[PDB]
């Protein structure tokens, strides 16, 4: 909004805040990312290490949906169990695919209560944590 801009505070001041010596010119230094290896090398090296060069192999026609694997941790599994199902519980069985998840990971603490987890994939620690609580895992597709 024009009323709050600092150019309105610089009316009457000759250089508009750009200096009398090092004035405001068109493109001193070049345009865009020009000179990123010549006179902007220190800036590129300091703030963007890794920028130039080529690492890894190409993948023609790489479809994103091939690598779609949403994940959920064990520490969140019991929030999917409703209150009345936990009261009834035998262990509740949760198919994490019905909540949008493919693989089960094992960060966090499970409560010391049995639970059955249905998933396409699971890590080794997540399986160890589920078994230590008295639960089980069923692999689905």
């Amino acid at each position: 909004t024009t009323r709050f801009k600092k150019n309105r505070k610089k009316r009457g001041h000759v250089s508009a805040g750009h200096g009398r010596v090092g004035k405001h010119r068109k493109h001193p230094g070049g345009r865009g990312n020009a000179g990123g290896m010549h006179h902007h090398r220190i800036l590129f090296d300091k703030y963007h290490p890794g920028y130039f060069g080529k690492v890894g192999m190409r993948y023609f026609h790489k479809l994103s949906n091939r690598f779609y694997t949403p994940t959920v941790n064990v520490e969140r599994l019991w929030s999917m169990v409703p209150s009345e199902k936990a009261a009834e519980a035998k262990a509740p069985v949760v198919d994490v695919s019905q909540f949008g998840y493919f693989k089960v990971l094992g960060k966090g603490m499970l409560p010391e209560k049995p639970i059955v987890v249905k998933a396409k994939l699971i890590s080794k620690i997540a399986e160890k944590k589920i078994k230590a609580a008295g639960g089980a895992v069923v692999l689905v597709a």
């Binding site: 169990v81 035998k90 509740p92 639960g135």
Partner: peptide
């Protein structure tokens, strides 16, 4: 969604 109760 259907959370069932089963015996392990």
């Amino acid at each position: 969604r259907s959370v069932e109760v089963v015996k392990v």
